[PDB]
Coordinates of C-alpha atoms in Angstrom, one line a residue:
Chain V
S1 CA -10.3 -8.7 17.7
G2 CA -12.6 -6.7 20.0
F3 CA -14.7 -3.6 19.1
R4 CA -14.3 -0.2 20.6
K5 CA -15.5 3.4 20.0
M6 CA -12.3 4.5 18.4
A7 CA -11.2 8.0 17.5
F8 CA -8.5 8.9 15.0
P9 CA -5.0 9.7 16.4
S10 CA -5.1 13.4 17.3
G11 CA -1.5 14.6 17.0
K12 CA -1.9 16.2 13.6
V13 CA -4.7 18.4 14.9
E14 CA -3.1 19.2 18.3
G15 CA -0.4 21.1 16.4
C16 CA -3.1 23.4 14.9
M17 CA -4.9 24.4 18.1
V18 CA -4.5 28.0 19.4
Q19 CA -6.0 30.3 21.8
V20 CA -8.0 33.3 20.5
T21 CA -9.1 36.2 22.8
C22 CA -11.3 39.1 22.0
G23 CA -12.5 41.4 24.7
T24 CA -13.1 39.2 27.8
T25 CA -13.9 36.1 25.7
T26 CA -11.4 33.4 25.2
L27 CA -12.0 30.3 23.0
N28 CA -10.1 28.0 20.6
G29 CA -9.0 28.6 17.1
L30 CA -7.6 26.4 14.3
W31 CA -4.3 27.6 12.8
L32 CA -3.5 26.3 9.3
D33 CA -0.9 28.0 7.1
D34 CA -1.1 31.7 8.0
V35 CA -4.9 31.7 8.9
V36 CA -6.6 31.1 12.2
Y37 CA -10.2 29.9 12.2
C38 CA -12.6 30.4 15.1
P39 CA -16.3 31.0 15.8
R40 CA -17.4 34.5 14.9
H41 CA -19.4 34.9 18.1
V42 CA -16.0 35.5 19.7
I43 CA -16.6 39.2 19.0
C44 CA -20.0 39.3 20.8
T45 CA -21.2 40.5 24.1
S46 CA -24.0 38.7 26.0
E47 CA -26.0 41.8 25.1
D48 CA -25.0 41.4 21.4
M49 CA -26.1 37.8 21.2
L50 CA -29.8 38.7 21.5
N51 CA -29.7 40.2 18.0
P52 CA -26.1 40.5 16.6
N53 CA -25.4 42.2 13.3
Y54 CA -22.1 40.4 12.8
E55 CA -20.9 42.4 9.8
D56 CA -21.5 45.5 11.8
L57 CA -19.8 44.3 15.0
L58 CA -16.7 43.0 13.0
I59 CA -16.4 46.3 11.2
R60 CA -16.0 48.1 14.5
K61 CA -13.0 45.9 15.4
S62 CA -9.3 46.1 14.5
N63 CA -6.6 43.5 14.2
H64 CA -5.2 44.4 17.6
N65 CA -8.5 43.5 19.3
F66 CA -7.5 39.9 18.5
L67 CA -5.0 38.1 20.8
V68 CA -3.8 34.8 19.3
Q69 CA -1.4 32.6 21.3
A70 CA 0.1 29.4 20.1
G71 CA 1.3 28.1 23.5
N72 CA 3.4 30.9 24.7
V73 CA 4.3 32.9 21.5
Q74 CA 1.6 35.4 20.7
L75 CA 0.6 35.5 17.0
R76 CA 0.3 38.9 15.4
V77 CA -3.0 39.4 13.6
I78 CA -2.3 41.2 10.3
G79 CA -5.8 40.9 8.9
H80 CA -9.3 39.6 9.7
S81 CA -12.4 38.6 7.6
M82 CA -15.6 36.7 8.0
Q83 CA -16.6 33.5 6.2
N84 CA -20.2 32.9 7.1
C85 CA -20.2 32.0 10.8
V86 CA -16.4 31.5 11.2
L87 CA -13.9 34.3 11.6
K88 CA -10.6 34.1 9.6
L89 CA -7.7 35.7 11.4
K90 CA -4.8 36.3 9.0
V91 CA -1.4 36.1 10.9
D92 CA 2.2 36.8 9.9
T93 CA 3.4 33.2 10.5
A94 CA 2.5 30.0 8.7
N95 CA 2.0 27.2 11.1
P96 CA 5.0 24.9 10.6
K97 CA 2.9 22.1 12.0
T98 CA 0.2 22.5 9.3
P99 CA -0.7 19.0 8.1
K100 CA -2.0 18.3 4.7
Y101 CA -5.7 19.1 5.2
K102 CA -9.1 19.6 3.5
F103 CA -12.4 21.2 4.6
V104 CA -15.2 18.7 4.1
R105 CA -18.8 18.8 5.0
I106 CA -20.2 15.5 6.3
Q107 CA -23.7 14.0 6.1
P108 CA -26.0 13.0 8.9
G109 CA -25.0 9.5 9.9
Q110 CA -21.3 10.0 9.3
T111 CA -18.8 9.9 12.2
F112 CA -15.9 12.0 13.1
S113 CA -13.4 12.5 15.9
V114 CA -13.6 15.5 18.2
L115 CA -10.6 17.1 19.9
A116 CA -12.0 18.9 22.8
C117 CA -9.9 21.9 23.7
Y118 CA -9.8 24.6 26.4
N119 CA -7.8 27.9 26.1
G120 CA -6.1 26.4 23.0
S121 CA -5.0 23.3 24.9
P122 CA -6.2 19.8 23.9
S123 CA -7.9 18.0 26.7
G124 CA -9.5 14.8 25.2
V125 CA -10.5 13.1 22.0
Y126 CA -13.7 11.1 21.3
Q127 CA -15.7 9.7 18.4
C128 CA -19.2 10.8 17.7
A129 CA -21.7 11.0 14.8
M130 CA -23.7 13.7 13.1
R131 CA -27.2 12.9 14.2
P132 CA -30.0 12.9 11.6
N133 CA -31.3 16.1 13.2
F134 CA -27.8 17.8 12.6
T135 CA -26.8 17.9 16.2
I136 CA -24.0 16.0 17.8
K137 CA -24.1 14.4 21.3
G138 CA -20.7 15.7 22.4
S139 CA -19.0 16.4 25.7
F140 CA -18.3 20.2 25.9
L141 CA -17.8 22.6 28.7
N142 CA -17.8 26.4 28.7
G143 CA -14.6 27.4 26.8
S144 CA -14.7 24.5 24.3
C145 CA -16.0 26.7 21.4
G146 CA -13.6 26.4 18.4
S147 CA -12.8 22.7 19.1
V148 CA -12.8 20.9 15.8
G149 CA -14.1 17.5 14.5
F150 CA -12.1 15.7 11.9
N151 CA -11.4 12.5 10.0
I152 CA -8.1 11.3 8.8
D153 CA -7.5 9.7 5.4
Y154 CA -3.9 8.5 4.8
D155 CA -1.9 11.6 6.0
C156 CA -4.7 14.1 5.2
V157 CA -6.9 15.7 7.9
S158 CA -10.5 16.3 6.7
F159 CA -11.8 18.9 9.1
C160 CA -15.6 18.7 9.1
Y161 CA -16.8 20.5 12.3
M162 CA -16.2 23.5 14.5
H163 CA -18.0 23.7 17.8
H164 CA -20.2 26.8 18.4
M165 CA -22.8 26.1 21.1
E166 CA -24.9 23.8 23.3
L167 CA -28.6 23.6 22.8
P168 CA -31.0 23.5 25.8
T169 CA -31.4 19.7 25.4
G170 CA -27.7 19.3 26.2
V171 CA -26.7 18.5 22.6
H172 CA -24.3 20.5 20.5
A173 CA -24.3 22.4 17.3
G174 CA -21.7 23.9 15.0
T175 CA -20.5 24.5 11.5
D176 CA -18.3 23.1 8.8
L177 CA -15.0 24.9 8.5
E178 CA -16.5 27.2 5.8
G179 CA -18.7 28.6 8.6
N180 CA -22.0 27.0 7.5
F181 CA -24.1 25.6 10.3
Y182 CA -25.1 22.0 10.4
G183 CA -28.8 22.1 10.8
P184 CA -31.2 25.0 11.2
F185 CA -29.2 26.5 14.0
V186 CA -27.9 30.1 14.3
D187 CA -25.2 31.8 16.4
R188 CA -27.8 34.1 18.1
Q189 CA -29.6 33.8 21.4
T190 CA -33.0 32.5 20.3
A191 CA -35.4 29.7 21.3
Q192 CA -33.5 27.2 19.1
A193 CA -34.3 23.5 19.6
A194 CA -33.1 20.3 17.9
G195 CA -35.7 18.6 15.8
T196 CA -36.8 15.0 16.3
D197 CA -33.9 12.6 16.1
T198 CA -34.0 9.2 14.5
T199 CA -31.7 6.1 14.6
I200 CA -29.1 5.7 11.9
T201 CA -30.3 2.3 10.5
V202 CA -27.3 1.6 8.2
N203 CA -25.0 2.1 11.1
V204 CA -26.9 -0.2 13.4
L205 CA -26.6 -2.9 10.6
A206 CA -22.9 -2.2 10.3
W207 CA -22.6 -2.8 14.1
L208 CA -24.6 -6.0 13.9
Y209 CA -22.0 -7.1 11.3
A210 CA -19.2 -6.0 13.6
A211 CA -20.7 -8.3 16.3
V212 CA -20.9 -11.3 14.0
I213 CA -17.3 -10.6 13.0
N214 CA -16.5 -10.7 16.7
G215 CA -18.4 -14.0 17.5
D216 CA -21.7 -12.6 18.8
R217 CA -24.4 -14.5 16.8
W218 CA -27.4 -15.0 19.1
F219 CA -29.5 -12.4 17.3
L220 CA -29.1 -14.0 13.9
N221 CA -32.1 -15.8 12.4
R222 CA -33.2 -17.8 9.4
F223 CA -35.5 -15.1 7.9
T224 CA -35.0 -12.6 5.2
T225 CA -37.0 -9.5 4.4
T226 CA -37.5 -7.1 1.5
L227 CA -36.2 -3.6 1.7
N228 CA -39.8 -2.3 1.6
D229 CA -41.0 -4.6 4.3
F230 CA -38.0 -3.7 6.5
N231 CA -38.5 0.0 6.1
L232 CA -42.2 -0.3 6.8
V233 CA -41.4 -1.8 10.2
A234 CA -38.3 0.3 11.1
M235 CA -39.9 3.7 10.4
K236 CA -42.4 2.7 13.0
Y237 CA -39.5 2.7 15.5
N238 CA -38.1 6.1 14.4
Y239 CA -35.4 4.4 12.3
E240 CA -34.0 6.2 9.2
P241 CA -35.1 4.4 6.0
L242 CA -32.6 2.0 4.4
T243 CA -31.7 2.5 0.8
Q244 CA -30.2 0.3 -1.9
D245 CA -27.1 2.6 -1.6
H246 CA -26.9 1.6 2.1
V247 CA -27.2 -2.0 1.1
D248 CA -24.4 -1.6 -1.5
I249 CA -22.2 0.1 1.1
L250 CA -22.8 -2.8 3.5
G251 CA -21.5 -5.1 0.7
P252 CA -18.0 -5.8 2.0
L253 CA -19.3 -6.6 5.5
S254 CA -21.9 -8.9 3.9
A255 CA -19.1 -10.6 2.0
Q256 CA -16.7 -11.0 4.9
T257 CA -19.5 -12.6 7.0
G258 CA -21.5 -14.3 4.3
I259 CA -24.8 -12.8 5.7
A260 CA -26.9 -11.0 3.1
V261 CA -28.0 -7.5 4.1
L262 CA -31.7 -8.3 3.9
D263 CA -30.9 -11.4 6.0
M264 CA -29.3 -9.1 8.7
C265 CA -32.3 -6.8 8.3
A266 CA -34.6 -9.6 9.4
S267 CA -32.5 -9.9 12.6
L268 CA -32.8 -6.2 13.2
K269 CA -36.5 -6.3 12.5
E270 CA -36.8 -9.1 15.1
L271 CA -34.6 -7.2 17.6
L272 CA -36.9 -4.1 17.2
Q273 CA -40.1 -6.1 17.8
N274 CA -38.8 -8.3 20.6
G275 CA -36.2 -6.3 22.5
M276 CA -33.0 -7.8 23.6
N277 CA -34.3 -9.8 26.6
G278 CA -31.4 -9.2 29.0
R279 CA -28.9 -10.1 26.3
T280 CA -26.1 -7.8 25.0
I281 CA -24.4 -7.2 21.6
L282 CA -20.7 -6.2 21.7
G283 CA -21.2 -5.3 25.4
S284 CA -24.2 -3.1 24.7
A285 CA -27.9 -3.5 25.8
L286 CA -29.0 -1.1 23.2
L287 CA -28.6 -1.0 19.4
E288 CA -25.6 1.1 18.6
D289 CA -25.8 3.6 15.7
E290 CA -22.6 5.6 15.8
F291 CA -20.4 3.2 13.8
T292 CA -20.5 3.6 10.0
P293 CA -19.9 0.7 7.6
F294 CA -16.4 2.2 7.0
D295 CA -15.7 2.4 10.8
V296 CA -16.4 -1.3 11.1
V297 CA -14.3 -2.3 8.2
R298 CA -11.5 -0.1 9.5
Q299 CA -11.5 -1.6 12.9
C300 CA -12.3 -5.2 12.0
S301 CA -9.6 -5.4 9.3
Chain C
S1 CA -22.2 19.3 29.3
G2 CA -22.6 15.8 27.9
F3 CA -20.7 12.6 28.8
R4 CA -18.5 10.7 26.4
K5 CA -15.9 7.9 26.6
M6 CA -13.0 10.2 26.2
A7 CA -9.3 9.3 25.5
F8 CA -6.3 11.6 26.2
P9 CA -4.9 13.5 23.2
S10 CA -2.5 11.1 21.6
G11 CA 0.1 13.4 19.8
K12 CA 2.8 13.1 22.5
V13 CA 2.7 9.3 22.1
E14 CA 2.4 9.2 18.3
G15 CA 5.9 10.8 18.1
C16 CA 7.3 7.8 20.0
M17 CA 5.9 5.0 17.9
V18 CA 8.3 3.0 15.7
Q19 CA 8.4 -0.2 13.7
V20 CA 10.5 -3.1 15.0
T21 CA 11.3 -6.1 12.8
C22 CA 13.1 -9.3 13.8
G23 CA 13.1 -12.3 11.4
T24 CA 9.8 -12.3 9.6
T25 CA 7.9 -10.7 12.6
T26 CA 7.1 -7.0 12.6
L27 CA 5.4 -5.2 15.5
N28 CA 5.5 -1.8 17.2
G29 CA 8.0 -0.3 19.6
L30 CA 8.1 2.7 21.9
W31 CA 11.1 5.0 21.3
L32 CA 12.0 7.2 24.2
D33 CA 15.4 8.9 24.5
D34 CA 17.9 6.4 22.9
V35 CA 15.9 3.3 23.9
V36 CA 13.2 1.4 22.0
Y37 CA 10.8 -0.8 24.0
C38 CA 8.9 -3.7 22.5
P39 CA 7.5 -7.2 23.4
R40 CA 10.3 -9.7 23.8
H41 CA 8.3 -12.3 21.9
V42 CA 9.4 -10.4 18.8
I43 CA 12.4 -12.8 18.7
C44 CA 10.2 -15.9 18.8
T45 CA 9.2 -18.5 16.2
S46 CA 5.8 -20.1 16.3
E47 CA 7.8 -23.2 17.2
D48 CA 9.5 -21.3 20.0
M49 CA 6.3 -20.0 21.6
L50 CA 5.4 -23.5 22.8
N51 CA 8.3 -23.4 25.3
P52 CA 10.6 -20.4 24.8
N53 CA 13.7 -19.9 26.8
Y54 CA 13.9 -16.2 26.2
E55 CA 17.3 -15.6 27.7
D56 CA 18.6 -18.3 25.5
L57 CA 16.9 -17.0 22.3
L58 CA 18.1 -13.5 22.9
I59 CA 21.7 -14.5 23.4
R60 CA 21.7 -16.1 20.0
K61 CA 20.8 -12.7 18.4
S62 CA 22.9 -9.7 17.4
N63 CA 22.1 -6.1 17.1
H64 CA 21.8 -6.4 13.3
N65 CA 18.9 -8.9 13.7
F66 CA 16.8 -5.9 14.8
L67 CA 15.4 -3.5 12.2
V68 CA 14.0 -0.3 13.7
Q69 CA 12.3 2.3 11.4
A70 CA 11.0 5.6 12.6
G71 CA 8.9 6.4 9.6
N72 CA 11.4 6.1 6.8
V73 CA 14.7 6.6 8.6
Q74 CA 16.1 3.3 9.9
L75 CA 17.4 3.4 13.5
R76 CA 20.7 1.6 14.1
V77 CA 20.5 -0.8 17.0
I78 CA 23.8 -0.4 19.0
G79 CA 22.8 -2.7 21.9
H80 CA 20.0 -4.8 23.2
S81 CA 18.9 -6.2 26.6
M82 CA 15.9 -7.8 28.2
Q83 CA 13.8 -6.3 31.1
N84 CA 11.4 -9.0 32.1
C85 CA 9.0 -9.4 29.2
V86 CA 10.0 -6.3 27.3
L87 CA 13.0 -6.0 25.1
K88 CA 15.1 -2.8 25.3
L89 CA 16.8 -1.8 22.0
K90 CA 19.5 0.8 22.5
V91 CA 19.9 3.0 19.4
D92 CA 22.3 5.7 18.4
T93 CA 19.7 8.5 18.3
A94 CA 17.7 10.0 21.1
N95 CA 14.1 10.6 20.0
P96 CA 13.8 14.4 19.6
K97 CA 10.1 14.0 20.1
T98 CA 10.5 12.3 23.5
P99 CA 8.0 13.8 25.9
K100 CA 8.4 14.1 29.6
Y101 CA 7.3 10.6 30.6
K102 CA 7.1 8.1 33.5
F103 CA 6.6 4.3 33.7
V104 CA 3.7 3.7 36.0
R105 CA 1.9 0.5 36.9
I106 CA -1.9 0.9 37.2
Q107 CA -4.5 -0.9 39.4
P108 CA -7.5 -2.9 38.4
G109 CA -10.3 -0.4 37.9
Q110 CA -8.1 2.4 36.7
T111 CA -8.5 3.7 33.1
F112 CA -6.1 4.6 30.4
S113 CA -6.0 5.5 26.7
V114 CA -4.7 3.0 24.1
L115 CA -3.0 4.2 20.9
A116 CA -3.5 1.2 18.6
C117 CA -0.7 0.9 16.1
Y118 CA 0.3 -1.1 13.1
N119 CA 3.8 -1.3 11.5
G120 CA 4.7 1.6 13.8
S121 CA 1.9 3.8 12.5
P122 CA -0.9 5.0 14.8
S123 CA -4.4 3.9 13.6
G124 CA -6.8 4.9 16.5
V125 CA -7.1 5.8 20.1
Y126 CA -9.6 4.6 22.7
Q127 CA -10.2 4.6 26.4
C128 CA -10.4 1.4 28.4
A129 CA -10.0 0.0 31.9
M130 CA -7.9 -2.6 33.5
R131 CA -10.5 -5.2 34.5
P132 CA -10.4 -6.7 38.0
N133 CA -9.1 -9.9 36.4
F134 CA -6.1 -8.0 34.9
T135 CA -7.3 -8.2 31.3
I136 CA -8.4 -5.3 29.1
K137 CA -11.3 -5.4 26.6
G138 CA -9.4 -3.7 23.8
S139 CA -9.6 -3.6 20.0
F140 CA -6.5 -5.2 18.6
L141 CA -5.7 -6.9 15.3
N142 CA -2.7 -9.0 14.3
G143 CA 0.3 -6.6 14.3
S144 CA -0.8 -4.4 17.2
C145 CA 1.7 -5.9 19.6
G146 CA 3.7 -3.1 21.2
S147 CA 0.9 -0.6 21.1
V148 CA 0.9 1.3 24.4
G149 CA -1.6 2.5 27.0
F150 CA -1.0 5.8 28.8
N151 CA -2.4 8.6 30.9
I152 CA -1.4 12.2 30.7
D153 CA -0.9 14.5 33.7
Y154 CA -0.1 18.1 32.8
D155 CA 2.6 17.6 30.1
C156 CA 3.8 14.2 31.4
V157 CA 2.9 10.9 29.8
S158 CA 2.5 8.1 32.3
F159 CA 2.9 4.9 30.2
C160 CA 1.2 2.0 31.9
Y161 CA 0.6 -0.7 29.4
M162 CA 2.2 -2.5 26.4
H163 CA 0.1 -4.9 24.4
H164 CA 1.4 -8.5 24.1
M165 CA -1.4 -10.9 23.2
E166 CA -5.1 -11.8 22.8
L167 CA -6.6 -14.5 25.1
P168 CA -9.0 -17.1 23.7
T169 CA -11.9 -15.2 25.2
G170 CA -11.2 -12.2 22.9
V171 CA -9.7 -10.1 25.7
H172 CA -6.2 -8.8 25.8
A173 CA -3.2 -9.0 28.1
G174 CA 0.1 -7.1 28.4
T175 CA 2.7 -5.7 30.7
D176 CA 3.7 -2.5 32.3
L177 CA 6.6 -0.7 30.6
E178 CA 9.0 -2.6 32.9
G179 CA 7.9 -5.8 31.3
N180 CA 5.9 -7.2 34.2
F181 CA 2.6 -8.8 33.1
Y182 CA -0.7 -7.6 34.4
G183 CA -2.3 -10.7 35.8
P184 CA -1.2 -14.4 35.7
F185 CA -0.5 -14.3 32.0
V186 CA 2.7 -15.3 30.3
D187 CA 4.2 -14.8 26.8
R188 CA 4.2 -18.5 26.0
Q189 CA 1.7 -20.6 24.1
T190 CA -0.2 -22.2 26.9
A191 CA -3.8 -22.8 27.9
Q192 CA -4.1 -19.4 29.5
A193 CA -7.5 -18.1 30.5
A194 CA -8.8 -15.0 32.1
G195 CA -10.2 -15.5 35.6
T196 CA -13.7 -14.5 36.6
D197 CA -14.3 -10.8 36.0
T198 CA -16.3 -8.5 38.3
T199 CA -17.9 -5.0 37.9
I200 CA -15.9 -2.0 39.2
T201 CA -18.3 -0.7 41.7
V202 CA -16.6 2.6 42.5
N203 CA -16.6 3.4 38.8
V204 CA -20.3 2.6 38.4
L205 CA -21.0 5.0 41.3
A206 CA -18.8 7.7 39.7
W207 CA -20.9 7.3 36.5
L208 CA -24.2 7.6 38.4
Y209 CA -22.8 10.8 39.7
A210 CA -21.9 11.9 36.1
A211 CA -25.5 11.2 35.2
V212 CA -26.8 13.4 38.0
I213 CA -24.4 16.1 37.0
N214 CA -25.9 15.8 33.5
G215 CA -29.5 16.0 34.6
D216 CA -30.4 12.3 34.7
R217 CA -32.1 11.7 38.1
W218 CA -34.8 9.0 37.5
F219 CA -32.8 6.3 39.4
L220 CA -32.3 8.4 42.6
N221 CA -34.2 7.5 45.7
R222 CA -34.9 8.5 49.2
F223 CA -33.1 5.6 50.8
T224 CA -29.6 5.3 52.3
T225 CA -27.6 2.1 53.0
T226 CA -24.6 1.2 55.1
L227 CA -21.4 0.2 53.5
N228 CA -21.8 -3.3 54.8
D229 CA -25.4 -3.7 53.7
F230 CA -24.4 -2.4 50.3
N231 CA -21.5 -4.8 49.9
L232 CA -23.6 -7.7 51.1
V233 CA -26.0 -7.1 48.2
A234 CA -23.5 -6.1 45.5
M235 CA -21.1 -9.0 45.9
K236 CA -24.2 -11.2 45.2
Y237 CA -24.1 -9.5 41.7
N238 CA -20.4 -10.0 41.1
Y239 CA -19.6 -6.4 42.0
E240 CA -16.3 -5.5 43.6
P241 CA -16.6 -4.5 47.2
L242 CA -16.7 -0.8 48.0
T243 CA -14.3 0.5 50.6
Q244 CA -14.2 3.6 52.7
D245 CA -11.3 4.7 50.5
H246 CA -13.6 4.5 47.5
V247 CA -16.2 6.5 49.5
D248 CA -13.5 9.1 50.2
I249 CA -12.5 9.3 46.6
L250 CA -16.1 9.9 45.5
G251 CA -16.2 12.9 47.9
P252 CA -15.8 15.7 45.4
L253 CA -18.6 14.2 43.3
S254 CA -20.8 13.8 46.4
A255 CA -20.1 17.5 47.1
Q256 CA -20.7 18.9 43.7
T257 CA -24.1 17.1 43.6
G258 CA -25.0 17.1 47.3
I259 CA -25.8 13.3 47.2
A260 CA -24.1 11.3 49.9
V261 CA -22.2 8.2 48.6
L262 CA -24.3 5.8 50.7
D263 CA -27.3 7.6 49.3
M264 CA -26.2 6.9 45.8
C265 CA -25.3 3.4 46.9
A266 CA -29.0 2.9 47.7
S267 CA -29.8 3.8 44.2
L268 CA -27.3 1.4 42.8
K269 CA -28.6 -1.3 45.1
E270 CA -32.1 -0.6 43.8
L271 CA -30.9 -0.7 40.2
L272 CA -29.2 -4.0 40.8
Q273 CA -32.3 -5.6 42.3
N274 CA -34.9 -4.0 39.8
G275 CA -33.1 -3.7 36.5
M276 CA -33.5 -0.5 34.5
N277 CA -37.0 -1.2 33.1
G278 CA -36.4 0.1 29.5
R279 CA -34.8 3.3 30.9
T280 CA -31.3 4.5 30.1
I281 CA -28.6 6.4 32.0
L282 CA -26.4 8.7 30.0
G283 CA -27.5 6.9 26.9
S284 CA -26.7 3.4 28.3
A285 CA -29.1 0.5 29.1
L286 CA -26.3 -1.1 31.3
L287 CA -24.4 0.1 34.3
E288 CA -21.1 1.5 33.0
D289 CA -18.0 0.8 35.0
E290 CA -15.0 2.1 32.9
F291 CA -15.1 5.7 34.2
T292 CA -13.1 6.4 37.3
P293 CA -14.1 9.1 39.8
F294 CA -11.2 11.2 38.3
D295 CA -12.5 10.7 34.8
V296 CA -15.9 12.1 35.8
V297 CA -14.4 15.1 37.6
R298 CA -12.1 15.7 34.6
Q299 CA -14.9 15.6 32.0
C300 CA -17.7 17.3 34.1
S301 CA -15.4 20.2 35.2

């Protein structure tokens, strides 16, 4: 037993990380088969970022403006193209360490592991969630651009995130691996800001279940609520609404514990309206919303 | 920027994980060069655990009672010996994936990454600390015995923990890789219990520094305290005492932020005596004590 913020084992992704240099800018790239993926702003100057025309900047570049190094061995760039906001660097060698992989776009509320990298070298791994406002609260220093987020199913790596930038609020924004940004964010120097964030209600419920599974029951109560009456209270607290789909997804946790979802909802309603009163759940004094129902099942069984 | 519970990249350790079976018991082993390390209770029966004589049980075993599988390929056990509470299984093949490694014993308060494994297969990675009472608050299900904890320095894996058991309080106990238990715990079915835990003061201070580094300053104050006056208050709250060594170790964080340790200590003293009053630090409503000074430096630079 126990409950921890748990990332996926990162080995399969470490074998794909490379260093990509263009001009005086170095950042990370993802090397799968004979393609290297990286943020397209790798070709930009600080002057360019104020109003880049990326198709114009990239056309003024040649393959030899791109230095790719997989550890020591330099990779020869034999061709380059743009896919939305990622750059695709064709290289002569297929990565022998290429895992089975897919490119998947995730939904707000879903979680993924991040392998933070610098100069193509992995430095740490952590779990986070796509916030409802399409930012992630990551840990990223200058040079981490190109670090990826991923899930693992069986032996297959679903890449879902490439890191592009930090917003002025200290949160982070990037794209899926097809180069499409999560959220209304752009790879240009503008006055971008994250919208209003909300709490991921279905995840808070999953985490209350995880607590019950782990012997924390002080917050449980005898009451039950209706979906509508729950939503009417939670939205007052900037909680995402809960759907019948959410209730279905929470089914297996409801079964393992024998507590109906709407029963648990009454607990969460009570916790929202009363606070926690110096008590903790699973070692936390706040309601935790970055564990999905699947993460709980995974870890608690 | 940002601050996350961050584990080390786990690839180098995933290549060492194997499955070890003996009787009807399967658990995990660590395969380095031509040796496989695993908990010695792998040879025990439930009946045996009540009073095992391990040197006697192991003598009644032969190499062929030990099935080691590295993925598919079975490994032939050509010899076996005991080192304290770990079992060393000599095998004919050196692990080609053996990283540079050391066996290191850590101190209460130090952190490490755990690669939780089942049937020799890695399932997740998370960061935790050796508690002052020599337990760890891990996430472990039946079958995780033999999962290891580790740090990484440059390319060198310092293995520091092998998982052996869960205590009745839900916390976990194991050994260093030389088979010596952390704490007063034994691999026998007895009435073992963890002692009284305390908070790792030097780590809480490091985390307050991490918060300052990340723009959270509401808890700072104009006061300064003496080491002695700080300890006199903290020990009242079940906080470990702070030493001059701790103050030295916090030096680089003090420098980067320009806040003297004893200055920060006055903040922590105030937070202990006043609570947090519905405020949070780095997204937490509790004082966090599982980041060392080194972890903060690592992540914040």
